[PDB]
Symmetry: D2
Subunit: 387 residues, 4 copies
Amino acid sequence: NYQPTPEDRFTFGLWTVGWQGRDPFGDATRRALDPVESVRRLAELGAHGVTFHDDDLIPFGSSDSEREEHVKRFRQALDDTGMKVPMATTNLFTHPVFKDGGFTANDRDVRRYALRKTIRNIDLAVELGAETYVAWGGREGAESGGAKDVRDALDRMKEAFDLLGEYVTSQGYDIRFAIEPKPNEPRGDILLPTVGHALAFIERLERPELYGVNPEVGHEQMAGLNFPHGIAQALWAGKLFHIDLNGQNGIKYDQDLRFGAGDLRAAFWLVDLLESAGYSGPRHFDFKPPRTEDFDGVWASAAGCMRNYLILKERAAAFRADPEVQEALRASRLDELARPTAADGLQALLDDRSAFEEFDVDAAAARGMAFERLDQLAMDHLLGARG
Amino acid sequence: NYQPTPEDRFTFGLWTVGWQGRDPFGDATRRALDPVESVRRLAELGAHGVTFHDDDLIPFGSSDSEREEHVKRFRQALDDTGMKVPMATTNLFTHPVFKDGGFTANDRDVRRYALRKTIRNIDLAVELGAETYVAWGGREGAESGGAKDVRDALDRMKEAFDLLGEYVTSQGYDIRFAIEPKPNEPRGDILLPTVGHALAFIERLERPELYGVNPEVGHEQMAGLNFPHGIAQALWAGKLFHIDLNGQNGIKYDQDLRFGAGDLRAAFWLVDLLESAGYSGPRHFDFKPPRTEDFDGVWASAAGCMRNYLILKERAAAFRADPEVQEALRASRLDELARPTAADGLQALLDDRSAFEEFDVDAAAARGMAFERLDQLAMDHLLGARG
Amino acid sequence: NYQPTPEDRFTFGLWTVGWQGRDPFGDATRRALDPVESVRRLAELGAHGVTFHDDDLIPFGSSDSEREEHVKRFRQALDDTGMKVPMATTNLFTHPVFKDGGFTANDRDVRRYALRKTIRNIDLAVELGAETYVAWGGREGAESGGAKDVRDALDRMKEAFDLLGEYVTSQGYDIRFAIEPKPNEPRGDILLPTVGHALAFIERLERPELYGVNPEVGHEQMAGLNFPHGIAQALWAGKLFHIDLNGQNGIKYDQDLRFGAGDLRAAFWLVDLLESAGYSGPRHFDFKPPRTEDFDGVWASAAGCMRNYLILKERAAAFRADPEVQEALRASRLDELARPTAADGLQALLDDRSAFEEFDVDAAAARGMAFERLDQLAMDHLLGARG
Amino acid sequence: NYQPTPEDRFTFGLWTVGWQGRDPFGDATRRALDPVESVRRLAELGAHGVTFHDDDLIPFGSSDSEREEHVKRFRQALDDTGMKVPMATTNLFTHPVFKDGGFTANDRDVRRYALRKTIRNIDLAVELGAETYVAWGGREGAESGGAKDVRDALDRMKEAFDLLGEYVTSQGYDIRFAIEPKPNEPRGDILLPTVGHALAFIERLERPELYGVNPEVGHEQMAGLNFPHGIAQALWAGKLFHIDLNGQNGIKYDQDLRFGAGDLRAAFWLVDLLESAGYSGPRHFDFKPPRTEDFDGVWASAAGCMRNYLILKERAAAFRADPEVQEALRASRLDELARPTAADGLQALLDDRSAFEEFDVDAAAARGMAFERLDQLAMDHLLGARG
Ligand SMILES: O=C(CO)[C@@H](O)[C@H](O)CO
Ligand SMILES: O=C(CO)[C@@H](O)[C@H](O)CO
Ligand SMILES: O=C(CO)[C@@H](O)[C@H](O)CO
Ligand SMILES: O=C(CO)[C@@H](O)[C@H](O)CO
Ligand SMILES: [Mg+2]
Ligand SMILES: [Mg+2]
Ligand SMILES: [Mg+2]
Ligand SMILES: [Mg+2]
Ligand SMILES: [Mg+2]
Ligand SMILES: [Mg+2]
Ligand SMILES: [Mg+2]
Ligand SMILES: [Mg+2]
Ligand SMILES: [O-]
Ligand SMILES: [O-]
Ligand SMILES: [O-]
Ligand SMILES: [O-]
């Protein structure tokens, strides 16, 4: 009944289930979860692996002595359970020294510090076997306009990612980076607000081949955009190295609801797309069990995630296979969208009088697109009202 | 008293002042303005030139006979007044044959037609002397998810812009293109929603050098982003070929208010940036005098535009020159932002123990950024409360 | 298979299916539909009745002669089909004389005119048998701040509704009014933006008993609010005389998609509420078939509406009846929410030391709310994944 | 040079300047400020008084012994400086026992507890001399739909405010309550989201006369509404007992920027309104110095607040007095808006043939409103470009 298996590629962040529940207007409602503990409960539910921030596994300020002790206990846990670690990131947002940013902070000294803190937790990412490395520059921005020269910051940002590449290139690591956009929160405005702004940025770096994106549901939905639309340009441009799943009800604070929640009609068009294009990386889940819940609630919430994906995957599978849905698509000319417009060459088109001088625009404009039917059909499938 | 002169580069679209006032819920409140008429009133107010859609100058369905008559009358007008035409575009949104799009429409035949309609009004753009050519794909999108394969559409979009380049390359024209993003309205979702999404798209075309952007105030402010932030990546990436100025009060229908209106604190940080980076192209104005106004109102509204830019330009000039503002900037370390972080090389940084092993993070984090003062200063300048 | 019958109370506006497709950036894509024609197709699909604007049935400027001819043809149509007319409204937004508003316009003369135009189409509303009368003040607002004294406008608004009541009171009509809020579009800001702002306004009129609300899905969802939350205060306060159903994808232009579309998880919590509280009025549908469609598309789109309501009604019915959903509710204490907090009186509470001096706050705060389970359950029901 | 004096009525919350800087994604960047310390620095800058949450002055869990010690030290501070305390509130959001709400929480026991916690800090509000008492129900809402019966919650909410009134009525206190709306954050959706939703709620309580509102800038601007528009209905309905000033850049997390910041054109239309209607209560400031700042920054940020109000007050004063602005207003008929529409009675209007049968609608619709000029004038005044 929609049971998950490691072969599904469902992964979680230690900081997701582990969220203690502290929000601007409230203290923590839950007690700390030990990383080994999250790992057994997850493996048990049907996951594949887990992701982490340096600061999640190794507490800030930890000596290299205690630092070994947390990596061994984790190491052992991964083995007794079989879980994997296909992605890792740095924590350049919590500590106060990052109040103005990491790679883009004004204090030059603060920038160097954040470049090392990363390089350090990259040697560990590999040591464990992570394939992708993500970077979320949440403290990279400004509330006021004279606080940041956006042109100077974009320089300090390319210089940061470049160095990192030169490092992985020398260290002959097979790892690749994933830049995660957010339009805002915790800064008034964040650098590289959406997938689009990050994709362009990557075509300016020295080694573009080593960079991609890790678009998150709610984040793109914080600017009011169509998430699936955005996962399309990344794939079209071959840059979807990773993805963060969750829920978001519109434009407002980053909610991070469990997957399926929020915009349900949208999560249906994402799975479909991810299945069609053959996305094989991990189906990550960057969510936060609400603070009105306890631990039995955190595990139910993380169960709902995978389960919602599985059903949606099914309901989408049928959608495409339905012999009737297939003819509606032809009725709406999605087959003609796939066909090149001018494979006949420019010259051919400039002389072809069927495209202008003789085109019957009136007869053509009267041709209905039949989009409302193909949708209600889609709707019956998601609800399971077809039969 | 803030009088404009053609040397300011203020330009307008024939369809701006000429707007008749028809909105979804209302008939037109103003009568049609003849293009020659807009041209004399504008030259009179202190402008430099005007932009246009093929359909603005040459009514849809016009024979090549009447078509010559509108280009001559315009031609003569430009001369008796001295106005110039530094930008031109096609109209792929009004006619019903474009209900599903132009370059990305599903009906292949509709795509070819829209490629020619453009190529035609490109030969005219040059004939007049336009330097830039803009493209706004407003009908390029979908309301439902199965209505468009976003990967197939991005193919038909690259194929469209490519052909156009092959054409201008053969026709040895010195013109360049400008893709204008919009996140939505009139379609539920529009392809290449923001500046970011268009910048990445341009690095995939065959001839990237011939493409740029024409970001519009309200449009980026329809997704809730920081406009100036966005004009920074375009400049940083050298792609600001043109720009559309106007006003927008938040997230909602595209208002197109006169310049200065809407977010005033933002229009102050844009002019400053445009002046600093030395933006020399035109200061275009894509606005719509509200329908509660008559013609004396349309001319006052177009007067307010340039005037607001001029004052803002002044108030920003003083801001930067103020000896006190200059030391606040140093106080907030914008001078250190400009300084490279690791010109000493990767190796130097990996050994430099001043950046990690010995960095005093606590002492550094206690260092205030002093951003609130530099802003109130900025605020006094905009209001003119410094003295 | 989710077939509707007049006993469902599904109604439509003549201006919904009849929409010709003209948007700010496009001419009409469909031809005019004659009112009698909409009436036969609708009765055929399974409806109960239709609503209208004076201007929909009787074209603006029509003489009392032709005016009788449109009311007779309509009259006859209603009979050959059995359809009813349970609601009617005035059209104070299209004509240019309403560019500054109707009841709140500055030109005093324009206000009187709009008061009569209404009183006229009220005598007709009854003549036909409408039970409710709706008022949408879309042109009541301003783009600029000095354009309207909001205190003076609220006076001219109470004076407008008052007079109307004095009229229906004298004409001994059994009709009641329904004020429909919108936060914006076509004006920069609209008076009485949300349900809340209209509910308060009604408690100031002379005859409050004769007024209520007609909240529309997308409209409240244009400000980013929770629609069902809003339909709750209206019912709690006994003011839901009518309702407009449709779809809206977030914050942006008013889409008016068919019902079910947009936020699907929200339309599930609305039907449930409407069924629980026993809402018996009409399940109106104020939507707009998209302009990429033709007539076969307009009828399919209006079919999807009712169908989506029917399924959602079912999936919600099961939800509540599920013996398991019932114990989850008890698990989450919705039964304790219904229980009064201090029926024991103030004094009893001030002495009751179980509520403060001895309350164990720590033990109580540790009590999980179990909300994530009751939701995934809800989710399985909507998708039909329970079994 | 825009210096404030207690006669201006500028007040602050202890929790504003005192904010330590902890946000969802970051630890505190500033150290704790002692209440007596905030009081001396504020009195020094030019304030009138300060507001507080029980939990700000008396730490949660404090014994009645230490509880006296904090009220005496505060008491003395107020005297050595002369500051006043015209408003006080309870803290029903931080502690975890309020994770599901206070007055509306499901656990009945949690509701009683929160009713007492309030009644307690009301006896103290008076003891000090506060005139108004505010209530912000931030934890009153839900993320999921089955988590809360919105009809049951509105019952538990009226029962809460009622009891409080019965208490102040018996305790013969001269105090009055102020309900502060927020559409969201920290809950997915909050009960009584906007000023409108709270105004209606007040007309259902047992003792309406004892209730009002305390609208906050950013909060109403979180739903995308026009703040000044909203302060107009409250005044029109005589319910503006208090107000919270600050800044907010659009729709997103609650920023709480210093006053003047965010939407500057809007803060100009608010002061004008507050000055015209003769608002005499306090000009409260509920803001948060950003966490990139230290203490010298917190005092500069709180200086900018009052200063921005003072200038805006001036620039607005001139606006109204300008002989030219006065004739523009007449030109735009704001004088006719103030004039009653039908003081002649219903009958008079029904017979008056100048309002319909003979009204020249075409001649009337051609009458421009001249709104764009009156605005550019307004703009010149705010910038100080008139002369
Ligand atoms: O996206 C967020 C928060 O909005 C983070 O969890 C990143 O994924 C990791 O830095
Ligand atoms: O931006 C718009 C409308 O939102 C257009 O005026 C383009 O500039 C021209 O197609
Ligand atoms: O709501 C709208 C448009 O947003 C109207 O159809 C009203 O229902 C009738 O005036
Ligand atoms: O408005 C907020 C936070 O958004 C509070 O500071 C209230 O004023 C007090 O509970
Ligand atoms: Mg997030
Ligand atoms: Mg994430
Ligand atoms: Mg625009
Ligand atoms: Mg434009
Ligand atoms: Mg609508
Ligand atoms: Mg409606
Ligand atoms: Mg706030
Ligand atoms: Mg507040
Ligand atoms: O997140
Ligand atoms: O535009
Ligand atoms: O509507
Ligand atoms: O706040």
